[PDB]
Amino acid sequence: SEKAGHQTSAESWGTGRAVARIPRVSGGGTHRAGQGAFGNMCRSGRMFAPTK
Amino acid sequence: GKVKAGQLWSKNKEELTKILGELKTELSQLRIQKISSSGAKLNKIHDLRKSIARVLTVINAKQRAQLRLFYKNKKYLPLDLRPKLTRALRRRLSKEDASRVLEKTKKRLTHFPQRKYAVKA
Amino acid sequence: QVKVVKATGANRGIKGRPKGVKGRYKMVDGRMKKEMRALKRLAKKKR
Amino acid sequence: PSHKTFRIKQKLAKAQKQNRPIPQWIRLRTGNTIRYNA
Amino acid sequence: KAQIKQALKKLYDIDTVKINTLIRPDGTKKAFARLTPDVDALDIAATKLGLV
Amino acid sequence: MKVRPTVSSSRRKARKAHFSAPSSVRRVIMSAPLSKELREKYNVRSIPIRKGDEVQIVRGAHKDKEGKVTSVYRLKYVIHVERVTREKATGQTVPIGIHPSNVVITKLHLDKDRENILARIKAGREQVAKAKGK
Amino acid sequence: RYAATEIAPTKSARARGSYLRVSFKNTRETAQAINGWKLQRALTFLQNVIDKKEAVPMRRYAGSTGRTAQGKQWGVSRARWPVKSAQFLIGLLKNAEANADAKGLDTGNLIIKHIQVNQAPKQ
Amino acid sequence: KTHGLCRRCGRRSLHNQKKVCASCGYPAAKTRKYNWSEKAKRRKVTGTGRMRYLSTVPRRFKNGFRTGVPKGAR
RNA sequence: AAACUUUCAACAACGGAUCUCUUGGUUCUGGCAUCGAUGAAGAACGCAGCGAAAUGCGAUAAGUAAUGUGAAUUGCAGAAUUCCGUGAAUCAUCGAAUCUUUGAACG
RNA sequence: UGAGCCCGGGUCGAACGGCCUCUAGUGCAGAUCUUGGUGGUAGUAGCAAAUACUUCAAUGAGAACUUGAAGGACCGAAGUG
RNA sequence: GAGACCGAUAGCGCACAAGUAGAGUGAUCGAAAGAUGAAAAGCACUUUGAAAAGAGGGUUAAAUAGCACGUGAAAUUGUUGA
Ligand SMILES: [Zn+2]
């Protein structure tokens, strides 16, 4: 599905934080909050070159 | 404590009302005496509740049949008795109005209607 | 003016503004040390 | 507070009704996967 | 209160001096019916209510 | 091989239908075969099982043992045969769930409805046999 | 199942406790303290530990433990009194002694052949 | 607090000053909806509720919106 | 020598990887066209003998009428069904109804 | 040679493999990688101030912080009401 | 109705009482979580324990399957052996 991996709101925390420069889900009251997204190496993320 | 639908259909309005009143009185009394030692009395209460529903359904159905017979030959019927269908289907043109066509088109079709024919191989 | 904050201790892996009450802050890392060295070597090559 | 409405009182009663535990016979039904209240 | 008094009168033949109503925390109504001095509450409860 | 487009060879859909079938479909599924004597008596191969039938268990740990059906427990696709039980720890006997495909019917509970079912099955079988023969 | 599977079950007594809310490190230290002893000696020692008459040596998990003359019984300086672990081991040892009584073994000649403390799922 | 309960959508999102629901816009006849929030659209789209009557329509269509009683029924 | 640190093995722990499965998802194809003032979509509160959620229903409330099938439901408890019958069922179909407060919501 | 392949012993319970072609979401130590789990640090840092507690008896398997009585302290009507 | 698709960190966020629990004043954000066994046959009875549980005993082909349940790796840990 073309919407797979993109049905989330994530933004990179920044550069100077001692964490990987990866988009992270906003929020703050669930396990999903703060986790990486939008990447091929991230769990529950998009696959590399999605099949068409 | 079970009331039969066939017997209810056979019976008329006054007997139906009498049975409904008896069932309601029995249900009230047996609920009052049920609140202590609610058992097979609970089973009986479930039975009378279903029986009251059945009697009410029979009374309502007979009344609606009578009303439909009364409004059989009248232009406007109650909205409850008018067919539901769909809002669009109700708004839709009637069959007569949809099939009604102009007189000139009628004449053209009368005197030149699609013919039956075949072409030899 | 702009205060520089090391992302270590209580400041490591935090979402936003740390406890430092100031107008403007800047988080730093060793990853940024290497970025900074790359920027200066490019600048010196250009000059 | 002490001043409220019967509707909000009924809503609080319903909230408690959800905040009751689960029945053992529900647990013992065949094909059941319910273990505890969530 | 009028409906409760009428119901106790017509169904169970109970004359009540007064009725006090409250709504319980669960949402049902509770009615205290104080009866006439002529009738006996114990006798009525034993006869028509099936309560000891 | 399937031909009609309405039927599906989908394992997923077939298992979903089998495990979510209503009680009447479960009855049809839990149809069971008849004995040989009943076979040449009624010209019927199989019939849905019911509570009053006498059956012979011929598959499972219970080798060749007979008994009256006690209950057709349609929820988990099993039937209960009289005297085919196992003792719990407490010593109370609980019936063993047996399958209609594993049982065979020896004596059949008779009424108007099942006589009609037998007549319909026999009529179809004899009509097709006559059509094939001549 | 038990770790020591080389012991025939008809000639020995056993006891088990699982998901016990007591410190794993202290329980291991006191189990090593009572390991290989006779049952009465172990029971008296555990009661003395509860009463702070004797202390168990802390061998491996012994960070910053005060020194006590009681440790001289073990040739060590770091000794401590794990009261809770002592009570738990007393409970299991009494259960094992009761199992031995049921089996008919002689209680005066029993030794703690095997004792093991493992980590339970964390809470 | 700036948000009490809204009677139309049931969320604690009606402003107490503006008297407008921030979720559905209750005083307006239309239900608030924007195409940049597919998640909100699919949170409050048809099928997320009870389906009182739209769930009963298809069977009447299948039988053809036919009215009456079976012949010979009591 | 023991203890302690470390190496290997056996067994036992922690943890849930691997293998196997799948009433689920994803993609494609085919037939058909059907919401609402005759009150929709959505929200709320009630209803089961013993139910909180899910599901169903609306004071006729885990449902009524009708048609078909033909002997159940099931966790327990209590009743059935005479079985040579207008008839069990958390059955199916479904043309008749009941359908609380709101919500386009309309004293 | 090697990436690897094959067998034995133990565990386990329902499917799997060789060969020739086809096809690909096909091979990891790193990416301050993602998710989850687990260590050393470590039984370590630490568990504050509101002056204060004590004796007997009772319940209980178990009593410093559960109770009764007795003492010794405190809020001091702008109260610890 | 189908597939040279995916097979529980995959495939829709959701194979489960998932747009649920939860977070935010709000617009909104939004998870984790499948598998005993053919059949519960889900351990009667005895004993220790305050109890939780343990040990005998029993069901099962198997408890080296006990509803912390198919198989059960590594990291890490305990005991024993060298
Ligand atoms: Zn609203």
Side-chain angles (χ1 to χ4, degrees):
Chain A
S1 76
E2 74 269 17
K3 294 182 286 297
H6 290 286
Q7 291 156 312
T8 176
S9 178
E11 164 49 56
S12 180
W13 278 12
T15 61
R17 276 92 182 175
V19 294
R21 48 189 69 242
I22 195 74
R24 302 190 179 271
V25 177
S26 65
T30 196
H31 278 152
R32 189 68 171 118
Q35 295 192 329
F38 283 145
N40 61 321
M41 79 295 289
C42 297
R43 178 195 179 273
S44 178
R46 177 202 55 233
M47 68 180 282
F48 162 69
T51 42
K52 317 294 217 213
Chain B
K2 275 79 70 176
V3 186
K4 275 167 189 277
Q7 276 154 19
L8 298 173
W9 288 124
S10 296
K11 294 180 176 66
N12 60 353
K13 299 298 293 295
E14 290 91 12
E15 303 167 38
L16 274 171
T17 56
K18 184 178 184 293
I19 289 157
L20 191 63
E22 293 179 353
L23 293 171
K24 284 178 162 263
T25 314
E26 183 174 358
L27 184 51
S28 59
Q29 292 295 108
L30 192 153
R31 273 211 189 267
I32 296 300
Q33 70 178 358
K34 176 266 300 176
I35 195 57
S36 295
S37 312
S38 72
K41 296 160 77 172
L42 292 159
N43 191 359
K44 190 168 175 68
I45 286 174
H46 165 260
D47 294 11
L48 294 86
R49 291 185 335 121
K50 299 293 183 182
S51 296
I52 295 187
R54 207 169 299 141
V55 174
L56 282 168
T57 315
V58 176
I59 291 172
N60 188 294
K62 292 177 71 68
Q63 184 62 256
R64 292 180 86 90
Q66 280 275 315
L67 294 174
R68 284 177 191 271
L69 193 144
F70 182 76
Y71 288 113
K72 182 175 174 66
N73 268 341
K74 260 179 175 47
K75 185 177 180 180
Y76 306 100
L77 282 72
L79 284 189
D80 286 330
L81 300 178
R82 274 180 219 196
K84 177 95 163 153
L85 313 166
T86 296
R87 176 195 181 103
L89 290 158
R90 295 204 311 272
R91 305 273 173 291
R92 183 177 292 171
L93 267 173
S94 80
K95 182 175 174 66
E96 194 149 11
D97 291 331
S99 296
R100 172 145 46 221
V101 57
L102 292 173
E103 67 289 351
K104 61 202 292 181
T105 295
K106 182 62 66 68
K107 297 174 183 179
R108 261 189 211 146
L109 292 184
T110 293
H111 294 300
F112 290 99
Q114 285 303 138
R115 296 289 294 274
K116 184 178 184 293
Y117 67 93
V119 177
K120 293 181 181 179
Chain C
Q1 213 183 11
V2 184
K3 67 182 290 294
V4 180
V5 176
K6 182 62 66 68
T8 61
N11 291 319
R12 161 146 161 208
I14 70 175
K15 182 67 181 294
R17 182 65 60 84
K19 277 74 69 177
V21 186
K22 202 63 183 179
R24 179 71 275 172
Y25 72 111
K26 191 203 200 314
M27 296 294 165
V28 292
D29 284 337
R31 179 68 181 271
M32 293 177 71
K33 277 199 190 172
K34 182 178 278 194
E35 310 294 324
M36 183 177 177
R37 294 178 65 88
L39 299 204
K40 293 181 176 66
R41 65 178 64 88
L42 294 174
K44 304 152 174 311
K45 185 262 290 180
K46 289 182 176 67
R47 269 72 174 175
Chain D
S2 179
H3 302 315
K4 71 174 82 63
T5 313
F6 167 63
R7 296 312 215 174
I8 192 176
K9 183 193 282 192
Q10 189 177 186
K11 286 177 69 68
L12 310 173
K14 186 142 158 192
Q16 294 179 356
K17 187 174 187 292
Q18 287 70 241
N19 212 318
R20 66 181 294 276
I22 315 301
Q24 294 178 357
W25 71 258
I26 290 291
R27 283 187 175 94
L28 183 63
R29 281 182 174 270
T30 58
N32 172 38
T33 71
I34 297 172
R35 303 172 182 86
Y36 73 104
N37 202 359
Chain E
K1 286 177 223 292
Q3 287 179 355
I4 294 173
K5 198 206 199 213
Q6 183 215 312
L8 278 71
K9 175 65 173 66
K10 188 269 183 182
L11 268 292
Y12 315 98
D13 184 52
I14 282 156
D15 300 331
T16 57
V17 165
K18 70 179 183 180
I19 296 169
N20 290 252
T21 56
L22 61 95
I23 295 170
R24 299 202 297 173
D26 57 357
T28 56
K29 191 169 280 186
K30 200 203 301 174
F32 310 83
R34 169 181 174 94
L35 285 80
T36 58
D38 300 6
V39 297
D40 273 350
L42 277 296
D43 286 333
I44 278 170
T47 300
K48 278 135 177 178
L49 264 49
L51 209 59
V52 175
Chain F
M1 177 69 213
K2 67 182 290 294
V3 163
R4 283 188 306 132
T6 315
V7 65
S8 66
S9 291
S10 178
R11 186 177 161 98
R12 200 169 91 161
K13 283 144 148 177
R15 283 179 45 97
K16 177 153 145 84
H18 175 85
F19 287 120
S20 60
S23 70
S24 53
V25 188
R26 291 180 183 270
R27 182 258 188 186
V28 165
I29 288 172
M30 272 183 288
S31 66
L34 303 178
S35 57
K36 299 298 293 295
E37 271 87 14
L38 287 177
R39 263 157 172 234
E40 287 86 4
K41 175 192 214 328
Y42 285 121
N43 206 38
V44 178
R45 296 292 299 274
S46 312
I47 205 164
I49 194 66
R50 78 162 283 166
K51 183 175 174 66
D53 292 330
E54 286 72 333
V55 306
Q56 177 179 328
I57 297 150
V58 298
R59 281 290 191 252
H62 318 311
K63 300 288 95 175
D64 290 326
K65 56 152 51 183
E66 309 212 338
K68 186 180 289 293
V69 169
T70 302
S71 83
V72 166
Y73 182 76
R74 277 178 207 199
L75 207 59
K76 66 179 73 174
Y77 283 122
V78 302
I79 67 171
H80 290 164
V81 179
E82 170 191 66
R83 292 188 296 272
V84 182
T85 55
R86 66 157 297 129
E87 293 180 346
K88 259 166 67 66
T90 67
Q92 179 252 329
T93 67
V94 287
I96 310 184
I98 315 175
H99 192 274
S101 69
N102 289 336
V103 307
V104 62
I105 299 170
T106 77
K107 184 178 184 293
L108 192 150
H109 191 91
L110 274 183
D111 51 358
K112 294 181 176 67
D113 294 335
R114 294 180 68 87
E115 183 179 1
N116 200 3
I117 300 167
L118 291 173
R120 298 192 256 114
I121 290 168
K122 175 163 135 36
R125 269 180 72 99
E126 65 89 21
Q127 186 259 324
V128 176
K130 164 199 56 156
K132 195 172 81 69
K134 64 181 72 64
Chain G
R1 180 63 186 164
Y2 286 82
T5 60
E6 65 97 19
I7 296 89
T10 181
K11 212 70 184 298
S12 68
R14 292 180 179 90
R16 185 180 295 275
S18 296
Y19 314 96
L20 302 180
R21 270 301 317 278
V22 66
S23 176
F24 161 76
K25 281 142 145 183
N26 302 132
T27 300
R28 180 256 173 201
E29 298 283 351
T30 185
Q32 296 294 321
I34 62 170
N35 190 1
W37 279 3
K38 293 182 183 293
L39 172 77
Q40 317 291 341
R41 172 65 190 131
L43 282 176
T44 308
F45 168 76
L46 289 181
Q47 191 62 261
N48 285 351
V49 174
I50 297 169
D51 292 331
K52 294 181 176 67
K53 285 326 212 179
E54 301 191 284
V56 300
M58 308 285 189
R59 301 287 188 181
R60 179 185 317 211
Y61 313 112
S64 297
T65 298
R67 318 191 264 198
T68 60
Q70 281 161 24
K72 276 193 301 219
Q73 287 302 111
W74 312 89
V76 73
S77 296
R78 292 188 297 272
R80 183 177 292 171
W81 303 268
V83 167
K84 205 170 170 183
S85 288
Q87 316 191 315
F88 274 64
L89 289 166
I90 297 193
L92 282 72
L93 278 150
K94 297 296 289 183
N95 202 243
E97 181 185 37
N99 302 338
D101 296 10
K103 277 172 147 270
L105 294 174
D106 194 0
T107 63
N109 209 45
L110 302 185
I111 75 188
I112 291 165
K113 182 67 181 294
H114 183 239
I115 185 165
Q116 186 177 7
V117 178
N118 272 112
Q119 294 168 75
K122 301 295 187 291
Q123 312 171 10
Chain H
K1 301 289 100 175
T2 178
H3 292 112
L5 206 70
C6 171
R7 326 215 237 94
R8 192 159 75 176
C9 73
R11 311 186 47 101
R12 183 178 182 270
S13 198
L14 192 125
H15 208 284
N16 294 314
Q17 295 311 303
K18 283 194 292 203
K19 272 147 64 50
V20 186
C21 179
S23 182
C24 78
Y26 163 68
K30 297 180 287 183
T31 298
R32 182 180 88 97
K33 180 175 71 176
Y34 296 95
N35 280 297
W36 41 257
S37 184
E38 274 307 328
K39 307 183 89 85
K41 280 165 68 74
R42 77 153 163 260
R43 277 177 182 111
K44 56 188 181 179
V45 74
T46 63
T48 68
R50 193 185 173 150
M51 303 282 318
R52 276 272 203 171
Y53 170 78
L54 192 57
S55 179
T56 61
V57 165
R59 196 183 71 214
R60 291 142 71 229
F61 167 86
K62 172 171 147 206
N63 297 274
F65 296 109
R66 64 180 176 88
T67 51
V69 300
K71 185 183 287 185
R74 65 196 185 180

